[PDB]
Amino acid sequence: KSAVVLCMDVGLAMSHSNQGKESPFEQAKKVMMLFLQRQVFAESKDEIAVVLYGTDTTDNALAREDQYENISVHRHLMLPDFDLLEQIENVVEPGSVQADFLDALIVSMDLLQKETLGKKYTRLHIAVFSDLSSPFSVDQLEVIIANLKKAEITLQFFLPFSVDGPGKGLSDQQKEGIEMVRKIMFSLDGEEGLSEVFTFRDSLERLSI
């Protein structure tokens, strides 16, 4: 079996709807639901956690004043079920704030480190869904990368636009986030990584590999 964290940006920017009929938030939720439905219907043994960042409340093991704020562990590492499906469809809502995606990655890594103790997995996987609209701190990113390598974690980023026609009006902050994603993925996978940025439209199939 494998262990997967879905690390989902639910910050305020994700609710801005100017691409089609579904906002980035609603598109990412739909992908998560289809993925989880596939897993439930197939009776897969993979364990799947859900970490949300950009939530109005804070609920994670690293949270303490001014640290890892606005990040919530919605589902711990366990088999998916219909309660999870019901919550994601009805409970999970857009947040009214923003959070640091590297903080959310650290929470996700800490969850995996603790909750995979004493168990055997073929792969550890973290999938991040975001529009990269909000700032982040790179403090100690070199430690994060070292541990992602040590634990052989596969990291996938999914964005609601292509980063390979007209330009898409990406903010400077989004462009900085994209470059950081590229630096992280290259650190992990080398030259191949520079292109390992995926879109929401391809995310369901890339997840289900």
């Binding site: 690293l62 590297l102 650290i106 890594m109 800490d110 403090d139 430690v143 994060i144 541990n147």
Partner: peptide
Amino acid sequence: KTRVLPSWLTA
């Protein structure tokens, strides 16, 4: 903005 990593990451 500095952060504090959990000890298992920096041990």
